[PDB]
Amino acid sequence: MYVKLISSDGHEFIVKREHALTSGTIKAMLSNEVNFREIPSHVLSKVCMYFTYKVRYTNSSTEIPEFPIAPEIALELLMAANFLDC
Amino acid sequence: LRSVNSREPSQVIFCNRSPRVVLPVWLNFDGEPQPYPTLPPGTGRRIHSYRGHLWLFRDAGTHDGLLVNQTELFVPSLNDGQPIFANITLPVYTLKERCLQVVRSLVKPENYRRLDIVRSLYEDLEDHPNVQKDLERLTQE
Amino acid sequence: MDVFLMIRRHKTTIFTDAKESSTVFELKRIVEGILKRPPDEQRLYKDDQLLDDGKTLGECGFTSQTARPQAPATVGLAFRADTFEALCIEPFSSPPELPDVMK
Numbered sequence: 001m002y003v004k005l006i007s008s009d010g011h012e013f014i015v016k017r018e019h020a021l022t023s024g025t026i027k028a029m030l031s032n033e034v035n036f037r038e039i040p041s042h043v044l045s046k047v048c049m050y051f052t053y054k055v056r057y058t059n060s061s062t063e064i065p066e067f068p069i070a071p072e073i074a075l076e077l078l079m080a081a082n083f084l085d086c
Numbered sequence: 087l088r089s090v091n092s093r094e095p096s097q098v099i100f101c102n103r104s105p106r107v108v109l110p111v112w113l114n115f116d117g118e119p120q121p122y123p124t125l126p127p128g129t130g131r132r133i134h135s136y137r138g139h140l141w142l143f144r145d146a147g148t149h150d151g152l153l154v155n156q157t158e159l160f161v162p163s164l165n166d167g168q169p170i171f172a173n174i175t176l177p178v179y180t181l182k183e184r185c186l187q188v189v190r191s192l193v194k195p196e197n198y199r200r201l202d203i204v205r206s207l208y209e210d211l212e213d214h215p216n217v218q219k220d221l222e223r224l225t226q227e
Numbered sequence: 228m229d230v231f232l233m234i235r236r237h238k239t240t241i242f243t244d245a246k247e248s249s250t251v252f253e254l255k256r257i258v259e260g261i262l263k264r265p266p267d268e269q270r271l272y273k274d275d276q277l278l279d280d281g282k283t284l285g286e287c288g289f290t291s292q293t294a295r296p297q298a299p300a301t302v303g304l305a306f307r308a309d310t311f312e313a314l315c316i317e318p319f320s321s322p323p324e325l326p327d328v329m330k
């Protein structure tokens with residue numbers, strides 16, 4: 001029901017399993033807990049926000065808002081996103 | 087992948103339900119994308135088109151793809167009375183594409199090479215989304 | 228209406244949603260179900276302000292405008308009861324500099 005995603009710096013994010021199964025990487029990594037040796041907290045929190053956003057807004061006519069990214073975070077987010085495949 | 091030249095007039099309303107300046111794009115009888123005037127966010131426009139013609143919408147600055155009535159293309163149907171309603175909306179972008187969008191929109195493309203990230207990402211940043219590209223993509227179905 | 232939250236304690240952060248109309252006490256059931264520890268052994272906060280069990284999350288300040296999927300509101304969580312620990316939330320890691328490429 002929930003899984004735990006731990007960031008490079010130790011913070012722990014507890015998230016619904018299907019939210020997490022957004023990422024094929026994670027799918028494979030679990031299958032429970034998963035450590036992310038290279039993803040700092042300010043990145044992996046954004047990622048979880050996008051999971052919650054994705055599950056919310058996919059398959060909806062109910063007008064969708066822009067997922068925001070601060071510039072400071074853009075690069076690291078790009079790198080995590082490319083790894084996690086999502 | 088072209089419009090049908092039916093000459094059966096059709097009235098449409100393009101509503102831009104998106105934070106982006108929208109660029110409407112009609113596909114010609116041959117197949118060339120024809121661009122039309124742009125729609126600021128929230129704004130609407132009443133439109134004269136025709137049954138069986140092809141439309142698709144994009145961000146006008148960056149050519150990011152957008153959805154119309156939940157799908158990729160828009161074909162004015164039997165008009166029945168009353169103008170046909172075309173809702174223009176953000177998709178749920180992948181988080182990767184989304185990141186590309188932001189990074190593209192901050193850096194000058196000259197300086198992409200000077201970003202310390204893998205090389206494959208450098209290629210992806212340059213592979214800008216675009217009509218002709220997507221029409222090739224969309225065509226194969 | 229769904230509200231979307233980050234329930235936070237120390238280096239623990241839970242992502243969950245809930246009805247605007249469910250109770251602070253009901254949120255504690257949910258935490259209990261996740262962190263395996265009873266509602267009496269836990270206190271909840273918005274910012275610094277301690278929340279009452281029978282108030283709804285709406286009444287407590289968590290609303291659609293305010294607790295969006297892409298920008299969930301934070302609920303502070305505290306533990307232990309023969310004495311309550313003080314509300315404490317480890318901040319997130321800092322982003323680097325910013326590349327001078329950024330007008």
Ligand SMILES: Cc1cc(CC(=O)N2C[C@H](O)C[C@H]2C(=O)NCc2ccc(-c3ccccc3)cc2)on1
Pocket residue numbers: 091093110112122123124125131133134135136139
């Ligand atoms: C016969 C015949 C002629 C044509 C070519 C044509 O008149 N078209 C092609 C498309 O179906 C639309 C239609 C057209 O150009 N109508 C005039 C027009 C002018 C401006 C707009 C417009 C769109 C977005 C924003 C602000 C203006 C739309 C339609 O198609 N069948």
